[PDB]
Amino acid sequence: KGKCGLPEIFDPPEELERKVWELARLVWQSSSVVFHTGAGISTASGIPDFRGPHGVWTMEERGLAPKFDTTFESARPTQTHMALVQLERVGLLRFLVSQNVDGLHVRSGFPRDKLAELHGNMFVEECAKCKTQYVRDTVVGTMGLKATGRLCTVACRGELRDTILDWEDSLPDRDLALADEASRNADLSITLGTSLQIRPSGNLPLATKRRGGRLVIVNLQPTKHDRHADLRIHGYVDEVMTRLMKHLGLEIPAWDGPRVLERALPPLPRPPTPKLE
Amino acid sequence: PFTADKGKCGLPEIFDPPEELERKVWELARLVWQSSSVVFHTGAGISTASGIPDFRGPHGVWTMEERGLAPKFDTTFESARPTQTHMALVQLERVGLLRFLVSQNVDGLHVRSGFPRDKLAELHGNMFVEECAKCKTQYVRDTVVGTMGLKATGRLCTVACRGELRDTILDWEDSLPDRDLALADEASRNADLSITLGTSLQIRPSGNLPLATKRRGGRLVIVNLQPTKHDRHADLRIHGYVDEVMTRLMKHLGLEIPAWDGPRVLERALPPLPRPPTPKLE
Numbered sequence: 411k412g413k414c415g416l417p418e419i420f421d422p423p424e425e426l427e428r429k430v431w432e433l434a435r436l437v438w439q440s441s442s443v444v445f446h447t448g449a450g451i452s453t454a455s456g457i458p459d460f461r462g463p464h465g466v467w468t469m470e471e472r473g474l475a476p477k478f479d480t481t482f483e484s485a486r487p488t489q490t491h492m493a494l495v496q497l498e499r500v501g502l503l504r505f506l507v508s509q510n511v512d513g514l515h516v517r518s519g520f521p522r523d524k525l526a527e528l529h530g531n532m533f534v535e536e537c538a539k540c541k542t543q544y545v546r547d548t549v550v551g552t553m554g555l556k557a558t559g560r561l562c563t564v565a566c567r568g569e570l571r572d573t574i575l576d577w578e579d580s581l582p583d584r585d586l587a588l589a590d591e592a593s594r595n596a597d598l599s600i601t602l603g604t605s606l607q608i609r610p611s612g613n614l615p616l617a618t619k620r621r622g623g624r625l626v627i628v629n630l631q632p633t634k635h636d637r638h639a640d641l642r643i644h645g646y647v648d649e650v651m652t653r654l655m656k657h658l659g660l661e662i663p664a665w666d667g668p669r670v671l672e673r674a675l676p677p678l679p680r681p682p683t684p685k686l687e
Numbered sequence: 688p689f690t691a692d693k694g695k696c697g698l699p700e701i702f703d704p705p706e707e708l709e710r711k712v713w714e715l716a717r718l719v720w721q722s723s724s725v726v727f728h729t730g731a732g733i734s735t736a737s738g739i740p741d742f743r744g745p746h747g748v749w750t751m752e753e754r755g756l757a758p759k760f761d762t763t764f765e766s767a768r769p770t771q772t773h774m775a776l777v778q779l780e781r782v783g784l785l786r787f788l789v790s791q792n793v794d795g796l797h798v799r800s801g802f803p804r805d806k807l808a809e810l811h812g813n814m815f816v817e818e819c820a821k822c823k824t825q826y827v828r829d830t831v832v833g834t835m836g837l838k839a840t841g842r843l844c845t846v847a848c849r850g851e852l853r854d855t856i857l858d859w860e861d862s863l864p865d866r867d868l869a870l871a872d873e874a875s876r877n878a879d880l881s882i883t884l885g886t887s888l889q890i891r892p893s894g895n896l897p898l899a900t901k902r903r904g905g906r907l908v909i910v911n912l913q914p915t916k917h918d919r920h921a922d923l924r925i926h927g928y929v930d931e932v933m934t935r936l937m938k939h940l941g942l943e944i945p946a947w948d949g950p951r952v953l954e955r956a957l958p959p960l961p962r963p964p965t966p967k968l969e
C-alpha cells in the first residue's frame with residue numbers, strides 16, 4: 411500500500427499564482443496534452459483518497475476508518491472533473507488517464523473514447539463472453555472481476571462481471587495500450603491528485619518525458635516522481651484548475667446530472683492564444 | 688476557548704435501509720406539499736460533501752480534537768462549491784416552497800450559492816462577511832475575512848464613515864446577532880413545517896429554534912446521519928446523506944437542481960417562479 415499519510419505541502423499564494431500562469435503557458439504551447447487523474451480529484455466531492463492524511467490506507471494503518479461524506483451514486487463531479495470535460499470539448503485535452511474507480515469522469519459526460527479507466531469503474535460491468543460493457547446508474551455490487559448475478563442482453567446471456575481489479579490483476583489491455591500511446595505521444599503530461607505510487611499507472615506520465623515532453627505534477631503531498639517534474643504545484647486541484655480555466659478564458663460547464671457519452675464530439679471554438687515569448 | 692462545552696462528539700452514524708429511506712423521502716414530499724410555511728435549519732453536515740469537515744461527526748473538528756487528531760479540509764473556503772443540497776435550497780426558495788433558511792454555518796456557501804440574504808439568518812456569522820462597528824453596514828467579500836471573534840480586520844467603512852470593519856464570527860461567549868435571531872425565531876414560530884439538515888442541534892438557542900415549530904401543531908423533520916438533541920420531538924427522522932435525501936425530494940416535487948454560476952450575492956428574494964401542480968394526497 412506504499413507511503414501513506416506524508417505531510418501536505420502548500421505553495422504560498424504568490425508562488426501558487428506564478429505556477430498556474432506557467433501551467434497555462436505550457437497548455438498554450440503544447441500540441442498534445444494528456445491528463446492523469448487519481449483519488450485527490452474526488453476528495454472535494456466527499457470521496458476519501460487512499461494515502462492522504464485521512465486516506466483509506468492511511469486510516470487503515472492507524473487503526474481508524476476512512477469517512478465518506480457521500481455515496482458513489484450521490485457523488486457530484488468536482489470543478490476539476492467539469493474543467494476536464496470543457497478542456498476536451500475545446501480541443502486542449504488529447505486524452506484522460508484515470509486510476510479512479512469512482513465512475514465520476516464517465517458520469518461528468520467525459521467521452522469514453524478519450525478515457526482510460528486503468529483500475530476499473532464501480533458502475534461498469536463487462537460480459538466475459540462478448541466483452542460488451544454496461545454503464546449502470548448504480549454501483550455494480552461486486553469487486554475483483556466477480557460475477558454480478560446479471561447476464562448479457564446483446565442480440566449472448568454471457569456472465570456480467572465487475573471491472574474492479576484486485577491487487578494481483580493486470581490492467582485491462584485496451585485501456586493501458588491507449589493510455590501508453592497517448593502518454594508516449596504527448597508533449598505535456600499533467601498529473602492531478604495522484605501520488606503516482608502504482609505501477610504501471612503512476613509511471614505513464616514519465617513516458618512523456620522521453621523525446622523532450624514536459625511533465626506537471628499537481629498534488630498536496632509529495633509523489634513518487636516529483637524529481638522528474640518540470641513543474642510541481644502544491645495546492646487544491648480545484649483552486650489550480652479554476653485559476654487555469656480563467657487564464658485560458660474558458661467557463662467550467664454545468665453538470666446536467668449523470669450522463670454517458672461514448673464518443674468525443676467535434677471540437678468547439680476556443681479563445682485565440684496569447685503571444686508568449 | 689480551552690474548556691468550552693463542545694457537547695457529544697463522534698456518535699455512531701445511522702443508515703436507514705434503502706426501502707425505509709425511499710418511504711421517508713416520499714413522506715417528506717407529502718409534508719412539503721401540505722405545508723403553508725416551510726423553514727429549513729442547516730448546520731455543517733450540508734457542506735461535508737464539498738470537503739468542509741463538520742464539528743461532531745466521526746471526523747468532525749471537535750471529534751478529531753478529542754482524539755488528539757486534526758480535521759481534514761479537501762478545499763479552501765474560497766474554492767468550496769455549494770453542494771446539491773445548497774442548490775436545491777436555492778430552487779425551493781425561488782418556487783415559493785421555502786419561507787426562510789436558518790443556518791449555523793460560517794462557511795459562506797448559502798450566500799455564495801445565490802440564496803437571498805433577506806430570507807437567510809446566519810446565526811454564527813459568515814467567514815466572508817465583515818461589519819462596520821459604527822453604521823452596522825455589512826460587506827460580502829470574495830475572500831475569507833482574516834479574523835474571528837468580532838475583531839478589527841484592518842479595513843475601514845467606505846459608506847458616504849471610515850468605521851472599523853469587524854468579522855461576524857461569534858466566539859463561544861458572544862450572543863447571537865439580534866436581527867438574524869429575531870427573524871429566525873419569528874420564521875420558526877410561524878412555520879407549520881421545520882426541516883433540519885446536517886445539524887446535531889446541540890447549540891442553544893440555534894438548535895432549539897426548530898422545536899418552536901412544534902408549538903401550535905407544527906411538524907418537525909430531522910435529516911441527519913448521527914442522532915440529534917431533539918430526535919424524540921421529530922415527526923420524521925431520516926438517517927441518510929442529505930444530498931441523496933434532497934435530490935430524491937426535488938425529483939418527487941418535479942423540480943430541477945439549478946446550475947451554480949459561481950460566487951454571487953443576492954440581497955433580496957426575487958418574485959416567485961412557477962411550480963408544478965400539487966398531487967392529490969388524502
Ligand SMILES: Nc1ncnc2c1ncn2[C@@H]1O[C@H](COP(=O)(O)OP(=O)(O)OC[C@H]2O[C@H](O)[C@H](O)[C@@H]2O)[C@@H](O)[C@H]1O
Pocket residue numbers: 447448449450451453454459460461462465509510511529602603604605606607608628629630631632645646647648761762
Ligand atoms: N483536493 C486535493 N487537491 C490536490 N491533491 C489532493 C487533494 N485531495 C487529495 N490530494 C492528493 O491526492 C493524492 C491521491 O493519491 P492516492 O491517495 O495515492 O490515490 P491514487 O489515485 O494516487 O492511488 C492509485 C491507486 O492506489 C489505490 O490502491 C487504488 O487502486 C488507486 O486507484 C494524495 O497525494 C493527496 O495528497
Ligand SMILES: Nc1ncnc2c1ncn2[C@@H]1O[C@H](COP(=O)(O)OP(=O)(O)OC[C@H]2O[C@H](O)[C@H](O)[C@@H]2O)[C@@H](O)[C@H]1O
Pocket residue numbers: 479480729730731732733735736741742743744747791792793811884885886887888889890910911912913914927928929930
Ligand atoms: N452528508 C451528510 N448528510 C447528513 N448528515 C451529515 C452529513 N455530513 C455530516 N452530517 C451530520 O451533520 C451533523 C452536523 O452537526 P455538528 O457537526 O454538530 O455541526 P452543527 O452545524 O450542528 O454545529 C453547530 C455549531 O457548533 C459548532 O461549534 C459551530 O459553532 C457550529 O455552527 C452531524 O450529526 C453529522 O452526523
Ligand SMILES: Nc1ccc(S(=O)(=O)N[C@H]2CC[C@H](O)CC2)cc1
Pocket residue numbers: 449452457458459460466511512529553574575
Ligand atoms: N477513493 C476511493 C474509491 C474506492 C474506494 S473502495 O470501494 O472502498 N475500495 C477500493 C476499490 C478499488 C480498488 O482499486 C482499491 C480499493 C475507496 C476510496
Ligand SMILES: Nc1ccc(S(=O)(=O)N[C@H]2CC[C@H](O)CC2)cc1
Pocket residue numbers: 731734739740741742748793794811835856857
Ligand atoms: N465546517 C467548519 C467551518 C469553519 C471552521 S473554522 O474556521 O476552522 N472554525 C470555526 C469557526 C466558527 C466557530 O463557530 C467555531 C470554530 C471549521 C469547520
Ligand SMILES: [Cl-]
Pocket residue numbers: 474475476745
Ligand atoms: Cl473513525
Ligand SMILES: [Cl-]
Pocket residue numbers: 529575576577608
Ligand atoms: Cl491497483
Ligand SMILES: [Zn+2]
Pocket residue numbers: 537538539540541542562563564566567568
Ligand atoms: Zn455478451
Ligand SMILES: [Zn+2]
Pocket residue numbers: 819820821822823824844845846848849850
Ligand atoms: Zn460604517
